[PDB]
Write a protein that binds this DNA or RNA. Structure first.
Ligand SMILES: [Zn+2]
Ligand SMILES: [Zn+2]
Lengths: 132, 132
DNA sequence: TGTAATTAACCTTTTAGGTTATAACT
DNA sequence: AGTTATAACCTAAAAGGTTAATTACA
C-alpha cells in the first residue's frame, strides 16, 4: 500500500502501461510495461527486472531509428578500410574520442556530413590523404 | 540608489567591469564594460547603449573564434560553386534550414565533417552527384 | 509589387566533446 | 604496459525546427 513519493495523492498499484517514446522524430509505444503506477499522477516505479526490460526496449528502439539512415556495419567497414581506429576516426571526422563507438553500436546518429563523407571515401579512399 | 533586484543586499552602482567570456574553449576578457553593478553580487544592469555594445563584442568574439577553424568566405564559395542555395546545402550537409546562414555569418561552427567534406568537394565538385 | 533568399530570435532534443571506469587485447 | 573498444556521465554547442523580420531581386 505504498503512496506515490511524487504527488503524495495516489497509491502505487502494480499493473502495466503502454509507454509512448520518441527519438529523432520517430514515435513508438512500448507496450504492456509492468511496473508500479501511481493512481493519481505519472509516477512509476519499476523493479530491476522491469527497468532492465524497459531500458533494453528503449535502447533497441533508438538503434533501429538510427539504422534507418546509416547502417552501423557500413561505418565500421569504411573505418577499418581507411585503416583508422575509432579514436583516429574521431580526430578526423569529429565527435570526440567516443564518437565512433556510439555510431557503430547504433546508439547515436552521425552528422549527415559524416555519413556523406564516409560515402565519398568508401568509393574514393585515396582522398583521405587530402584532408587528413 | 536602486537596490539589487537579485540579492536585495547590494546597491546598483555605475561603473565598469572586465567581463570574462568563453566560447568553444576560447577565453577572452571584454574590458571596461559600463553598467550598473551590484555591490554585493554579480547582478549587472546595462542600458540599451551598454547592452548593444556588449552584445556586439560578444558576437564579434564568437565570430573570430569560429573563423579560426573555418573561413565563412570558404563556405559561401564552395556552396555557390556547387550551385546550392543555403536550404539546398543544409538538406545535403545537415544542420536544418538555417544551418548555412549561421556558418556563413560566423555565428556557429560547422561539424568537422562538414568542413572536411566541403574541402573534398571544393577540389572535386563532380563528387556531389555521388551523394546528393 | 510580390517571391525567393537570407538573417534573427528563440525553443527543445541530440550530439560534440571530454572524463573516468572497465575490460579485452597486443 | 600501453592500445582498443564499450560504457555512463557531465557541460556546452550545434541540430533541427518554428516564426518573424529582412534583404535581393523577377
Ligand atoms: Zn502520484
Ligand atoms: Zn545583488
Amino acid at each position: 500500500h505504498m503512496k506515490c513519493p511524487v504527488c503524495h495523492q495516489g497509491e502505487m498499484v502494480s499493473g502495466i502501461k503502454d509507454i509512448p517514446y520518441t527519438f529523432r522524430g520517430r514515435k513508438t509505444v512500448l507496450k504492456g510495461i509492468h511496473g508500479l503506477y501511481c493512481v493519481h499522477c505519472e509516477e512509476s516505479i519499476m523493479n530491476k527486472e522491469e527497468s532492465d526490460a524497459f531500458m533494453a526496449q528503449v535502447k533497441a528502439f533508438r538503434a533501429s531509428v538510427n539504422a534507418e539512415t546509416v547502417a552501423p556495419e557500413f561505418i565500421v567497414k569504411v573505418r577499418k578500410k581507411l585503416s583508422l581506429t575509432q579514436k583516429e576516426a574521431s580526430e578526423i571526422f569529429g565527435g570526440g574520442v567516443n564518437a565512433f563507438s556510439r555510431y557503430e553500436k547504433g546508439n547515436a546518429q552521425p552528422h549527415p556530413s559524416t555519413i556523406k563523407l564516409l560515402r565519398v571515401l568508401d568509393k574514393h579512399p585515396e582522398l583521405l590523404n587530402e584532408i587528413r
